[PDB]
Amino acid sequence: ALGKLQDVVNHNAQALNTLVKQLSSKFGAISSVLNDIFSRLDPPEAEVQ
Amino acid sequence: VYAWNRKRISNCVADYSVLYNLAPFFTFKCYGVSPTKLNDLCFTNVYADS
Amino acid sequence: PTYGVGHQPYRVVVLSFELLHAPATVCGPKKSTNLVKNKCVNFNFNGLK
């Protein structure tokens, strides 16, 4: 029955891992790297992405 | 139009400021913008058609 | 030449580039400086900054 304690640990670990994985999402933008967008897109339209 | 003469450009330093001043071009467009700062970014597999 | 505004010849050159998928065969004009180690510094490696 220690899985009950284990499940508490796993859920927090899983949720944190899900948050980390979300960074790679482009969210409809050109790329998921903040720096690359700015060098690729000029300030007049970079803020859109 | 039929040919779509294309060039595979590689292994050289590319400066596009030459183009801007060249032959008083009366139109251009990038679809990836940053015409001023294209010169800073390195590129892979540059392929130009005319 | 008479049909001035309408069908005067325009030459169009279109160049395409792929963005930092691999070592860059072609690069823009930028100087290179000596690297430093074990120092919290800004780095711009082949466009990856």
Side-chain angles (χ1 to χ4, degrees), chain B residues 1-41:
Chain B
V1 296
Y2 311 137
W4 311 124
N5 224 346
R6 62 225 74 101
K7 309 300 156 275
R8 178 45 53 71
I9 315 99
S10 92
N11 314 120
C12 47
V13 198
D15 166 8
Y16 328 106
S17 61
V18 156
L19 312 174
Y20 306 144
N21 57 78
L22 221 44
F25 80 94
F26 300 115
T27 170
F28 96 109
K29 172 212 65 46
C30 268
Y31 258 43
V33 83
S34 299
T36 59
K37 44 166 178 140
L38 304 174
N39 320 66
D40 319 303
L41 317 176

Side-chain angles (χ1 to χ4, degrees), chain A residues 19-31:
Chain A
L19 205 50
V20 169
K21 199 73 58 44
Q22 280 290 124
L23 279 100
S24 95
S25 152
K26 268 157 44 88
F27 292 116
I30 322 290
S31 84

Side-chain angles (χ1 to χ4, degrees), chain B residues 38-49:
Chain B
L38 304 174
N39 320 66
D40 319 303
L41 317 176
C42 284
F43 293 128
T44 45
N45 199 331
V46 153
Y47 162 89
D49 209 281

